[PDB]
Design a protein around this ligand. Structure first.
Ligand SMILES: Oc1ccc(/N=C/c2c(O)ccc3ccccc23)cc1
Length: 293
């Protein structure tokens, strides 16, 4: 009521987003409404902690408003998300130096969050936001841990499994920072090829798409995998794909970085910090995108 809804930005992870102007300050912000027993107070404290997260590559959380017994998050507003940008770039593709710059910044954001013991758990093109100056920022960090993990969005919309790490699909109870690196790996592949890497339409389809590409994991590549809660010995055994087939025509530095982000074993999977030192980034620059707003 102290905001004017300018528009509905979209339908998000834990709820719906709006572009709002604050009549008081005239400042334009993104306003996220979260789903009702009167709310948990655990989530409120944890999310409140996120306000202290400040990094150039993290969308700033401005306020957490608990009032009239509902929860609103107030975020700095950015004009476009990576999903829309990829669709807009689908004819020509995103130039390699911009993909590289975007990946580099995203890993910086992740390195920062992970070093503060904050996980995203939900990464996807919709929650990566871009501006006219060439920056890219991660949004909705730590929301997943605060709350629980739904099989739906808010009300009747289909949750994206495409970016989900295999340890999550296999029913692992404890997430690590590795799940964010996996998601980012999928997004990197998607910027390069202009199609989603693993567009699963169900949980098992998601798993089997990963298996058909990277090979069905076994105890050799992933010690402990056959003991995972949802692991079935009856899984079909697919041979790993020639990797040059996965993301053509990305060069070998990029392919090498991607393979390290996509390791099955969360323990072998590269860290955001280590990834920043990969030779892929030796020539990194910061180009400006062509943005139609
Ligand atoms: O055409 C578009 C216009 C504005 C957009 N902003 C989305 C956004 C934001 O500007 C700030 C924080 C967020 C947090 C979660 C999800 C989206 C956002 C996206 C596409």
């Amino acid at each position: 009521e102290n905001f004017q809804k300018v528009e509905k930005i979209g339908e998000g992870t834990y709820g719906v987003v709006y572009k709002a102007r604050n009549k008081l300050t005239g400042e334009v912000v993104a306003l996220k409404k979260i789903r009702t027993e009167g709310v948990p107070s655990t989530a409120i404290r944890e999310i409140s902690l996120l306000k202290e997260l400040n990094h150039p590559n993290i969308v700033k959380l401005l306020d957490v408003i608990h009032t009239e017994n509902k929860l609103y998050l107030v975020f700095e507003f950015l004009h476009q998300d990576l999903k829309k940008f990829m669709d807009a770039s689908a004819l020509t593709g995103i130039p390699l130096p911009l993909i590289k710059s975007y990946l580099f910044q995203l890993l910086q954001g992740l390195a920062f969050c992970h070093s503060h013991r904050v996980l995203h758990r939900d990464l996807k093109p919709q929650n990566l936001l871009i501006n006219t100056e060439g920056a890219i920022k991660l949004a909705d960090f730590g929301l997943a841990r605060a709350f629980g993990v739904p099989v739906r969005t808010y009300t009747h919309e289909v949750v994206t499994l495409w970016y989900r790490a295999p340890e999550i699909l296999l029913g692992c109870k404890y997430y690590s920072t590795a799940v964010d690196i996996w998601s980012l790996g999928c997004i990197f592949a998607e910027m390069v090829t202009r199609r989603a890497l693993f567009p699963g339409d169900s949980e098992i389809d998601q798993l089997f798409r990963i298996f058909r590409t990277l090979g069905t994991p076994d105890e050799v590549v992933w010690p402990g995998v056959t003991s995972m809660p949802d692991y079935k010995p009856s899984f079909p055994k697919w041979a790993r794909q020639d990797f040059s087939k996965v993301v053509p025509p990305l060069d070998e530095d990029g392919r090498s970085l991607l393979s390290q982000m996509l390791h099955y074993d969360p323990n072998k999977r590269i860290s955001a910090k280590a990834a920043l030192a990969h030779p892929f980034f030796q020539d990194v620059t910061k180009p400006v995108p062509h943005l139609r707003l």
